[PDB]
């Protein structure tokens, strides 16, 4: 992640890697919203314009994930999908709207100190927080600058005034997409970059001091420019579909 | 049990940056 | 959209 710091053992038992078999590689990131379910970015799985499309077959998934390279032996978990679920009003054509998808693990993952779920909002929770200025941590082993960490990368970002988020871009945004990251003036940087994608936007609830997945890494044209913020997915509006 | 980090919350740790989250 | 911009693949 642009302008970030290295993660800690246990600090996000909810992160999984989107690692195809061959070119045996890492394509994205995901979250454990179950004992046997996983959700993530949409494009991250079906992007025509840059010919892509996968299947359970294609890829295999991985958990317990501190090191980005290694073989997390007896602390790392892994299984391959049993079926992918894209979301029917997806706009890879338009702006990468309802950038979401879920993957029913062919097999169930039993938890531990490294693999532990996340919960999803309620208009309530999704209301206290989802507010200008209130920050969120976004993780992943993406692109250190606009080369790749050896370990996990954690940033913190404040929401942004819905308007200001509009004239950051030039792409037409929907009440479904939410934009994070500090300002030009603010004097401080951060951003989740290449491969940060499909990553969680976990926010902490002061009420029940629970960890609440507020978003999903969708886009941004860049990697920490004095003038734009990244854009993520409303884990919520879409809380219906999920 | 979800949202409950077994190496922090689950038994009182608070990660180096969480508290920056808090304000 | 994803990677990227400022409709070309990676890099």
> Is there a contact between A8 and B15 if contact means CB atoms under 8 Å apart?
yes
The owner of tokens 């997806």 is A90
* A43 among known catalytic residues: yes
Q: Which residues pair with A179 in a beta bridge?
A: A231
Measured between beta carbons, which residues in chain A are less than 8 angstroms from residue C6?
221-222
* A67 among known catalytic residues: no
Q: Running DSSP on this structure, what letter comes out for residue A42?
A: S
* Residue in chain B lying closest to A114 (CA): B6
Q: Under a CB-based contact definition with an 8 Å cutoff, are residues A84 and A166 in contact?
A: no
> What is the rounded CA–CA span in Å between residue A138 and residue A97?
20
Measured between beta carbons, which residues in chain C are less than 8 angstroms from residue A44?
2
The contacts of residue A208 (CB under 8 Å, 6+ apart) are B3
Q: Is the peptide bond before A23 cis (omega within 30 degrees of 0)?
A: yes
C-alpha angle with apex A36: A196 to B11, nearest 5 degrees? Answer: 75
> Is there a contact between B20 and A117 if contact means CB atoms under 8 Å apart?
no
> What is the rounded CA–CA span in Å between residue A204 and residue A162?
21
Q: Under a CB-based contact definition with an 8 Å cutoff, are residues A169 and A221 in contact?
A: yes
Measured between beta carbons, which residues in chain A are less than 8 angstroms from residue C11?
none
- For the purposes of burial, counting CB atoms within 10 Å of the CB of A168, is it exposed (0-12), middle (13-18) or buried (19 or more)? buried
Using DSSP's 3-state secondary structure scheme, residue A227 falls into coil
* A99 among known catalytic residues: yes
The contacts of residue A156 (CB under 8 Å, 6+ apart) are A135, A136, A137, A138, A190, B17, B20, B21
Q: Which of A49, A218, A220 sits opposite C7 (nearest CB)?
A: A49
SS3 for A147-204, per residue?
A: CCCCECEEEEEEECCCCCCCCCCCCCCCCCEEECCCCCCCCCCCECCCCCCCCEEEEE
Residues 1-23 of B with CB under 8 A from A: 1-9, 13, 15-18, 20-22
Q: Under a CB-based contact definition with an 8 Å cutoff, are residues A16 and A37 in contact?
A: no
* CATH T-level fold of A13-117+237-242: Thrombin, subunit H (2.40.10)
Q: How many residues does chain C have?
A: 11
> What is the rounded CA–CA span in Å between residue A91 and residue A210?
32
The encoded tokens of residue B10 equal 């689950």
| Number of helices and strands in chain C (H, E) | 0, 0
> Is there a contact between A43 and C2 if contact means CB atoms under 8 Å apart?
yes
> What is the rounded CA–CA span in Å between residue B2 and residue A117?
5
Q: Please, how many CA atoms are within 13 Å of residue A236, restricted to the half-sphere of its CB?
A: 19
| Number of helices and strands in chain B (H, E) | 1, 0
Query: Which sign does the torsion angle of CA A148, A66, B16, A141 carry?
Result: positive
Q: Under a CB-based contact definition with an 8 Å cutoff, are residues A30 and A213 in contact?
A: no
| Nearest CA-CA partner of A141 in A130, A128, A132, A150 | A150
Q: Please, how many CA atoms are within 13 Å of residue A185, restricted to the half-sphere of its CB?
A: 0
Residue B20 has phi, psi (to 5 degrees) of: -85, -25
Residue A21 has phi, psi (to 5 degrees) of: -80, -30
> What is the rounded CA–CA span in Å between residue A39 and residue C1?
20
Structure determination method: X-ray
SS3 for A75-134, per residue?
A: CCEEECEEEEEECCCCCCCCCCCCCCEEEEECCCCCCECCECCCECCCCCHHHHCCCECC
Cβ atoms < 10 Å from Cβ of B6: 17
Residue among A31, A66, A97, A99 flagged as catalytic = A99
Measured between beta carbons, which residues in chain A are less than 8 angstroms from residue B18?
204
Q: Under a CB-based contact definition with an 8 Å cutoff, are residues A172 and A144 in contact?
A: no
**C and B interact (at least 3 Cβ pairs within 8 A):** no
Q: Under a CB-based contact definition with an 8 Å cutoff, are residues A29 and A12 in contact?
A: no
Integer angstrom CA distances of residue B22 from A83, A131, A175, B14, B16: 38, 14, 26, 11, 12
Using DSSP's 3-state secondary structure scheme, residue B9 falls into helix
> Is there a contact between A204 and B21 if contact means CB atoms under 8 Å apart?
yes
The contacts of residue A109 (CB under 8 Å, 6+ apart) are A32, A35, A36, A63, A77, A79, A115
Q: Under a CB-based contact definition with an 8 Å cutoff, are residues A218 and A90 in contact?
A: no
H or E element in which residue A16 lies: strand A15-21
Q: Which of A119, A137, A209 sits opposite B9 (nearest CB)?
A: A209
Could you state, in order of their start, the residue ranges of all structural domains in chain A? 1-12+118-236, 13-117+237-242
- For the purposes of burial, counting CB atoms within 10 Å of the CB of A111, is it exposed (0-12), middle (13-18) or buried (19 or more)? middle
**Resolution in angstrom units:** 3.5
Q: Under a CB-based contact definition with an 8 Å cutoff, are residues A101 and A88 in contact?
A: no
> What is the rounded CA–CA span in Å between residue A45 and residue A54?
6
What CATH architecture does domain A1-12+118-236 belong to?
A: Beta Barrel (2.40)
> What is the rounded CA–CA span in Å between residue B10 and residue C3?
36
Mutate which of C1, C3, C6, C11 to disrupt the A interface (most A C-beta within 10 Å)?
C1
């Amino acid at each position: 992640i642009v302008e970030g710091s290295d993660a800690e053992i246990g600090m996000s038992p909810w992160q999984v890697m989107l690692f195809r078999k061959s070119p045996q590689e890492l394509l994205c990131g995901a979250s454990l919203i179950s004992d046997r379910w996983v959700l993530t970015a949409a494009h991250c799985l079906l992007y025509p314009p840059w010919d892509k499309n996968f299947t359970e077959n294609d890829l295999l998934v991985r958990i317990g994930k501190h090191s980005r390279t290694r073989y997390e032996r007896n602390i790392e978990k892994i299984s391959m999908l049993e079926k992918i679920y894209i979301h029917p009003r997806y706009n890879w054509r338009e702006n990468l709207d309802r950038d979401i998808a879920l993957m029913k693990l062919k097999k169930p993952v039993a938890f531990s100190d490294y693999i532990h779920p996340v919960c999803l909002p309620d208009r309530e929770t999704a209301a206290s927080l989802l507010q200008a200025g209130y920050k969120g941590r976004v993780t992943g082993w993406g692109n250190l600058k606009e080369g790749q960490p050896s370990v996990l990368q954690v940033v913190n970002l404040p929401i942004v005034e819905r308007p200001v988020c509009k004239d950051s871009t030039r792409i037409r945004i929907t009440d479904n997409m939410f934009c994070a990251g500090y300002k030009p003036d603010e004097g401080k940087r951060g951003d989740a970059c290449e491969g940060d994608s499909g990553g969680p936007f976990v926010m902490k609830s002061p009420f029940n001091n629970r960890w609440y997945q507020m978003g999903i890494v969708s886009w941004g044209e860049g990697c920490d420019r004095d003038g734009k913020y990244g854009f993520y997915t409303h884990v919520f509006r879409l809380k219906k579909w999920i | 049990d979800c949202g409950l980090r077994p190496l922090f919350e689950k038994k009182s740790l608070e990660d180096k940056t969480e508290r920056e989250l808090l304000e | 959209x994803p990677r990227s911009x400022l409709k070309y693949e990676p890099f």
